[PDB]
Amino acid sequence: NHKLIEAVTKSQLRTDLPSFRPGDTLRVHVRIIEGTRERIQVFEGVVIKRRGGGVSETFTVRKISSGVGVERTFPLHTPKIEKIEVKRRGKVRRAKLYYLRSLRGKAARIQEI
Amino acid sequence: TKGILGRKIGMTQVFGENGELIPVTVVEAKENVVLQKKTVEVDGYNAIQVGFEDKKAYKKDAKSNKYANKPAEGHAKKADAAPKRFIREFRNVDVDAYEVGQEVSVDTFVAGDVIDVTGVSKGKGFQGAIKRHGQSRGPMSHGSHFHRAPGSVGMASDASRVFKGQKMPGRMGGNTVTVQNLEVVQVDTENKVILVKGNVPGPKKGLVEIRTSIK
Amino acid sequence: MIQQETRLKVADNSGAREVLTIKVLGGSGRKTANIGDVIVCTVKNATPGGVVKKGDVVKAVIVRTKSGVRRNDGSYIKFDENACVIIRDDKGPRGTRIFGPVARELREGNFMKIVSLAPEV
Amino acid sequence: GYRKLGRTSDQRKAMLRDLATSLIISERIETTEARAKEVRSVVEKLITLGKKGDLASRRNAAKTLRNVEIQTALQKLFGEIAERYTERQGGYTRILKQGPRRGDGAESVIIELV
Amino acid sequence: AVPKRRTSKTRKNKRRTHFKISVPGMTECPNCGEYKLSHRVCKNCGSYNG
RNA sequence: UAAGGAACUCGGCAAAAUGACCCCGUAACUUCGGGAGAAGGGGUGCUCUUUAGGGUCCCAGAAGAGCCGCAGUGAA
RNA sequence: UUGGCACCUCGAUGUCGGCUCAUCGCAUCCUGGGGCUGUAGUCGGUCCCAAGGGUUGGGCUGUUCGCCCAUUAAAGCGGUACGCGAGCUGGGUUCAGAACGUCGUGAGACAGUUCGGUCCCUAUCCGUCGUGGGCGUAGGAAAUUUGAGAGGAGCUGUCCUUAGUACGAGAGGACCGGGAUGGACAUACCUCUGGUGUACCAGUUGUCGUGCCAACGGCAUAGCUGGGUAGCUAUGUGUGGACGGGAUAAGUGCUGAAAGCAUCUAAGCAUGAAGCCCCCCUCAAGAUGAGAUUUCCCAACUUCGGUUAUAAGAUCCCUCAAAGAUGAUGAGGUUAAUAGGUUCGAGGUGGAAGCAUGGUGACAUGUGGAGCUGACGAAUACUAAUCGAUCGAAGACUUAAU
Question: What are the residue boundaries of the structural domains of chain B, listed by start?
Fold first, then answer.
């Protein structure tokens, strides 16, 4: 906080987003402009990290597509995420779940609250 | 438009109106006044002195620069102003400001998006040729005793000397650098700030000079 | 790529199974390629029942990458492995199948036949 | 770090625990200027623990003092040293310059509990 | 490397121009009467009184 | 130490990688001894239950149920 | 280049090639400007101007050379003790050992080959890269500036359109323009993606200690491991080489005679390059030719004719960081927020001690996203920047003008 950087970026903060913490399964509805046509692509995955800040806060989601792990990083207050949903909440000791980048099957499944 | 003086506050980011991400530098500009108006008859060039931040009044025993001395205190009072730190001269304007103080406000940069920013510091100590000039290190496969050393400084005998402009170690950084074609993102009254698109030279709490692009 | 010795894993139904990068095409001094970039490669592994046999120079496009690509919005995509696709003397592949998720934006009017056969884009 | 003192991280932390214990035991010690500017920030944070007075504060303060007898150095804290500054906020020490010393020319100061 | 040539006592005396020390920067203590170093305590019988 | 990986260079020099114990398993060749610790894989913490050993309190085991973390010859 | 001489050096001038780091020539490889063509167009040939920038990564070899693979707008040729060992390596060769082919009766030699093998130095003076102090610039000071001169930068591709048009039977396929996005290079920065983060958080192995259980501390590379704040950073994020003016080279000309015609030239008038001088960025009045503008201070004692201290101002000394070898330069010194602490936040970690409950037990659950927290934002004088001392002007003489 500087209080002069805030009040300059305070208008661009989005209050729509729900509260979530590293370890839970999340569904992000991203707007796509492929060519011309607006679509809503749904990315569903586990929240592996969440690095902090004000208007500059982010988070990354990890999903496995066709046997290949895909990690997608987003800014928290980007105007291209229509909505976010918390499909499940998982139990997890760490704040950055970077072990799951090397666990593949049923050793990479996170328990539930 | 007219140049302004400001302080670097920090970097941040906003979101452009179609969804873009824009790196931003926040530059506060407040207390800017026109202290002198140099003209061709009195001095050869035409320019305007502006005065940035506000210093405190004169004190009989002052052991720091916080308080104005008698010469400075007398130079501001001719414009009907308050002592000012960072006095600077802007050329390539059109002299329709007043040699008696008038506020130079951020609201004059609503018109004029592309600017250039002159900053006056970078700041690093004595540095080697790999850091200072981007040279290349020696190998470690063979038993090389050469790693971060400068290298050959000339030819043998026929030259019998080193040429002016050889690259060697010395104090690095701290110069004056201008970044050209930067773009104003948004101005802000009630905080007197300008959001410049990119990054300006200098450390935080440094002085920056914004003016309209010469290209 | 990153020193022209990179072993990439072909994501194609074309015989070749891994390739070694011989050259990053484009520019005189260019030293690294990313998603959407054309490379020259040589086949080090090939299935025993394929059409592109091991040991021959070919061309390819990068489809996945571990380092991934930033986007204008500030979002990023990173995959788990490097992967390429063997292309013809124009764009468009040499096998009839693509495997795994192709990069989201290999579409420019150029590689629409690769982003058409990919399981996910 | 905050400032190194010619000691490695381990020898420095030990020297600071030693100096802070000696200061709270005797209440005025003669040392070098550069170490008096470092014990300044380590003893004042112990009297804050002594002014809180919890049981978690005794145990979070026990891991920066040494086990010397007088009472123990942890019982003198939480007792007299913490009872006299119960309304004072900050500034629990004061350093006084004495001058250079023979053999090193190192500015020797006295530091005490205000 | 080794000096190629002997050094005059002109060159030596010039180069020792800035090799000196300065006066200790001292005041007079207004209790001891004697001299002291400013911002230090009175080394004579006395105190600081700052 | 990102991404790659010997591209460096005379030359993978130097460093990193393997390394303990208990189990499976193990090639061409051979002077029939060997090669061979070939190669290639699996296990390893603590708690509680039952349970033939051995020495004369000490030493060695089977199996089952469970707890935890990123990690179990958790360091050398 | 292979040589020829034998002029300097034998009280000693280290030999390749590469690495690192350059500088210069033009007999120009690319890009720019043109004349001729056996130049239809897209490509070419060959000559003339031109040195501003640029001029790749690997396989084989000690390789310089060379051949090959994949590119590139292009992969120029030369000089500088075949640049460069007080910068580095040392593979080769010119040490000693030992083996092969050949020559010698022999000790041993090469028309050759093969395995191996101690490369020194605390830089005086000139030179170069940074930084200060003395004096000067006819009173003493604070800031802001002009710019004589100096340095930097200077590269190029590919697509779309004009247009499938001009040209050509067709095949093919433009100049002159107009847009868009790259490669290499430079510079600034740390919001983003990453790196580090030895006085941040936690988990966990052996052993010793705080008398014991619980809780903590030392040592084992920071014992190790999973993350990580500020600062420093690239692979990350921004920008740049744009637009234009003057005089020209090769070339192209207009009027024009000497020479009634002709002729770009003798007089006169044009046009014409990535090159030359400006324009773009940085330095710069020790520029002894020492510049300019605004502001501030300016009486007492003498006959010294000069002196004095003090004024404006700046240092000593002390608290520091945006700065930094040190100093210097910046933020401050009680009429105060400069640092440390203390209160409150941001970010970091991940849910503490104690107690209660559920289990035989390892453990789990609750209070409480809790509690700890180096560098980051705000405020508060509580502690420390006390008292005080030093330096620093009275403005020379001529001449014109008023």
Answer: 1-215
Q: Which nucleotide's C1' atom has the smallest distance to the CA of C2?
A: F4
Distance CA A99, CA A93 (A): 12
User: Residue C96 belongs to what domain range?
Assistant: 1-121
Instruction: Show the tokens assigned to D62.
Output: 């026990």
Which CATH number goes with the domain that contains C20? 2.40.150.20
- Structural domains counted in chain E: 1
> Pick from C34, C32, C20, C19: which is nearest to C65 by CA?
C34
Burial of A26 per CB tally in 10 Å (0-12, 13-18, 19+):
buried
Amino acid at the residue A56: S
Q: Strand pairing of C83-86 and C7-10?
A: parallel
Domain with D29 in it: 1-114
Query: Could you identify the residue written with the tokens 């040699």?
Result: B99
Sign of CA dihedral E23, E29, E34, E39: negative
What resolution in angstrom units was achieved for this structure?
A: 3.1
Chains near B (3 or more Cβ pairs under 8 Å): A, C
Instruction: Quote the number of domains for chain C.
Output: 1
| Distance separating alpha carbons of residues A110 and C104, to the nearest angstrom | 28
Two structure tokens written together for A7: 């009040």
Angle, alpha carbons B120-B125-B130 (nearest 5°): 105
Nucleic strand F within 7 A of Cβ A93: yes
The answer to the question of whether B136 is labelled as a binding residue is yes
Give residue ranges of A with CB < 8 Å to any C CB: 30, 34-35, 65-75, 78, 80, 101
**Residue A76's closest chain B neighbor by CA?**
B15
- Contact across the interface for B26 and A80, Cβ inside 8 Å: no
d(CA C118, CA C97): 7
